[PDB]
Design an enzyme around this catalytic site. Structure first.
Site, PDB file in Angstrom:
ATOM      1  N   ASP A  25       0.830  -1.318   0.087  1.00  0.00           N
ATOM      2  CA  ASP A  25      -0.081   0.020  -0.064  1.00  0.00           C
ATOM      3  C   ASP A  25       0.770   1.116  -0.101  1.00  0.00           C
ATOM      4  O   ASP A  25       1.362   1.791   1.269  1.00  0.00           O
ATOM      5  CB  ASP A  25      -0.931  -0.014   1.252  1.00  0.00           C
ATOM      6  CG  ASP A  25      -1.943   1.235   1.267  1.00  0.00           C
ATOM      7  OD1 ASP A  25      -1.734   2.262   0.241  1.00  0.00           O
ATOM      8  OD2 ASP A  25      -2.999   0.953   1.894  1.00  0.00           O
ATOM      9  N   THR A  26       1.073   1.810  -1.260  1.00  0.00           N
ATOM     10  CA  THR A  26       1.938   3.332  -1.325  1.00  0.00           C
ATOM     11  C   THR A  26       1.230   4.242  -0.630  1.00  0.00           C
ATOM     12  O   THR A  26       1.923   5.288  -0.396  1.00  0.00           O
ATOM     13  CB  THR A  26       2.089   3.267  -2.585  1.00  0.00           C
ATOM     14  OG1 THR A  26       1.077   3.633  -3.368  1.00  0.00           O
ATOM     15  CG2 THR A  26       3.178   2.154  -3.427  1.00  0.00           C
ATOM     16  N   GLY A  27      -0.137   4.176  -0.413  1.00  0.00           N
ATOM     17  CA  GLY A  27      -0.561   5.451   0.442  1.00  0.00           C
ATOM     18  C   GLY A  27      -0.459   5.409   1.769  1.00  0.00           C
ATOM     19  O   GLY A  27      -1.045   6.373   2.462  1.00  0.00           O
TER      20      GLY A  27
HETATM   21  N1  LIG Z   1     -11.740   2.156  -1.633  1.00  0.00           N
HETATM   22  C1  LIG Z   1     -10.988   3.350  -1.782  1.00  0.00           C
HETATM   23  O1  LIG Z   1     -10.532   3.587  -2.987  1.00  0.00           O
HETATM   24  C2  LIG Z   1     -10.089   3.829  -0.800  1.00  0.00           C
HETATM   25  C3  LIG Z   1     -10.098   2.868   0.475  1.00  0.00           C
HETATM   26  C4  LIG Z   1      -9.326   3.407   1.534  1.00  0.00           C
HETATM   27  C5  LIG Z   1      -8.991   4.513   1.690  1.00  0.00           C
HETATM   28  S1  LIG Z   1      -8.325   5.439   3.139  1.00  0.00           S
HETATM   29  O2  LIG Z   1      -8.644   4.517   4.137  1.00  0.00           O
HETATM   30  O3  LIG Z   1      -8.715   6.605   3.185  1.00  0.00           O
HETATM   31  N2  LIG Z   1      -6.673   5.230   2.624  1.00  0.00           N
HETATM   32  C6  LIG Z   1      -6.318   6.661   2.006  1.00  0.00           C
HETATM   33  C7  LIG Z   1      -5.108   7.447   2.853  1.00  0.00           C
HETATM   34  C8  LIG Z   1      -4.243   8.003   2.264  1.00  0.00           C
HETATM   35  C9  LIG Z   1      -3.269   9.040   3.001  1.00  0.00           C
HETATM   36  C10 LIG Z   1      -3.741   9.283   4.517  1.00  0.00           C
HETATM   37  C11 LIG Z   1      -2.893  10.323   4.854  1.00  0.00           C
HETATM   38  F1  LIG Z   1      -3.637  11.276   5.233  1.00  0.00           F
HETATM   39  F2  LIG Z   1      -2.750   9.843   6.064  1.00  0.00           F
HETATM   40  F3  LIG Z   1      -1.873  10.813   4.354  1.00  0.00           F
HETATM   41  C12 LIG Z   1      -4.788   8.706   5.111  1.00  0.00           C
HETATM   42  C13 LIG Z   1      -5.609   7.655   4.224  1.00  0.00           C
HETATM   43  C14 LIG Z   1      -5.964   4.025   2.839  1.00  0.00           C
HETATM   44  C15 LIG Z   1      -5.702   3.674   1.354  1.00  0.00           C
HETATM   45  N3  LIG Z   1      -4.385   3.309   1.231  1.00  0.00           N
HETATM   46  C16 LIG Z   1      -3.547   4.149   2.166  1.00  0.00           C
HETATM   47  C17 LIG Z   1      -4.447   4.350   3.296  1.00  0.00           C
HETATM   48  N4  LIG Z   1      -4.290   3.236   4.278  1.00  0.00           N
HETATM   49  C18 LIG Z   1      -4.453   3.188   5.712  1.00  0.00           C
HETATM   50  C19 LIG Z   1      -3.618   4.097   6.459  1.00  0.00           C
HETATM   51  C20 LIG Z   1      -4.314   5.333   6.869  1.00  0.00           C
HETATM   52  C21 LIG Z   1      -3.537   6.158   7.804  1.00  0.00           C
HETATM   53  O4  LIG Z   1      -4.102   7.503   8.322  1.00  0.00           O
HETATM   54  C22 LIG Z   1      -2.326   5.827   7.998  1.00  0.00           C
HETATM   55  C23 LIG Z   1      -1.726   4.667   7.655  1.00  0.00           C
HETATM   56  O5  LIG Z   1      -0.463   4.240   7.810  1.00  0.00           O
HETATM   57  C24 LIG Z   1      -2.584   3.778   6.796  1.00  0.00           C
HETATM   58  C25 LIG Z   1      -9.253   5.603   0.627  1.00  0.00           C
HETATM   59  C26 LIG Z   1      -9.817   5.085  -0.503  1.00  0.00           C
END
Ligand SMILES: NC(=O)c1ccc(S(=O)(=O)N(Cc2ccc(C(F)(F)F)cc2)[C@H]2CNC[C@@H]2NCc2cc(O)cc(O)c2)cc1
Ligand SMILES: [Cl-]
Ligand SMILES: [Cl-]
Ligand SMILES: [Cl-]
EC number: 3.4.23.16
Lengths: 99, 99
Positions: A25-27
């Site tokens: 999970d790159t996000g």
């Molecule tokens: N169905 C879909 O398309 C979809 C599914 C899930 C999400 S999500 O939950 O909002 N999201 C994204 C995310 C990215 C970045 C951040 C940051 F704000 F912290 F940068 C939070 C959440 C997930 C999706 N992939 C990255 C993120 N993973 C969970 C996560 C959240 C966090 O705050 C810290 C972490 O280490 C890990 C969104 C979309």
């Protein structure tokens, strides 16, 4: 090896002696794993996104095996709907995005 | 390009003629963008994130440029911590994970 993104990029990991399926999970800043026991001290953390926040326990210096690569880093444990391998460990195995 | 993961993989996108910052997120199935005006009719979609499920607006065949690469596809609009480019569009632009 190259992994396309037609489907979720799932892999098998070994952590705390258990095998689990997890999403590359790159996000994700952090690696987040469903409830399980890990050794050592931990501290509470909140992480959020779509749908709100969950509370997790932060463990440091945890060893994970991912596709034959051993890597060490922080693991957050809590009620995540999916086990995820975040950037803190993806860097350690030399994972990059390419296009 | 090849993007390492030591920092968040944030890129510039262009949608509705405007530049925005967005995250390349292999853990997101879909592309979710912060509130903005998009053309056409929308339909409802429920998506699951880290904290649970929410309703968002689904727009189809939306033109979006990602790091200069042109894509046309489904864009969801709703409350999100950051603009997210998910697998639906990552696949369009030929993005793979490599290690
Ligand atoms: N169905 C879909 O398309 C979809 C599914 C899930 C999400 S999500 O939950 O909002 N999201 C994204 C995310 C990215 C970045 C951040 C940051 F704000 F912290 F940068 C939070 C959440 C997930 C999706 N992939 C990255 C993120 N993973 C969970 C996560 C959240 C966090 O705050 C810290 C972490 O280490 C890990 C969104 C979309
Ligand atoms: Cl770490
Ligand atoms: Cl590197
Ligand atoms: Cl699409």
């Amino acid at each position: 090896p190259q992994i396309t993104l037609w489907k979720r990029p799932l892999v098998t990991i070994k952590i705390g002696g258990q095998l689990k399926e997890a999403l590359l999970d790159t996000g994700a800043d952090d690696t987040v794993i469903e409830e399980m026991s890990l050794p050592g001290r931990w501290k509470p953390k909140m992480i959020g996104g779509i749908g709100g926040f969950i509370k997790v326990r932060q463990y440091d210096q945890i060893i994970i095996e991912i596709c034959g690569h051993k890597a060490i880093g922080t693991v957050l444990v809590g009620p995540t709907p999916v086990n995820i391998i975040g950037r803190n460990l993806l860097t350690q195995i030399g994972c990059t995005l390419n296009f």
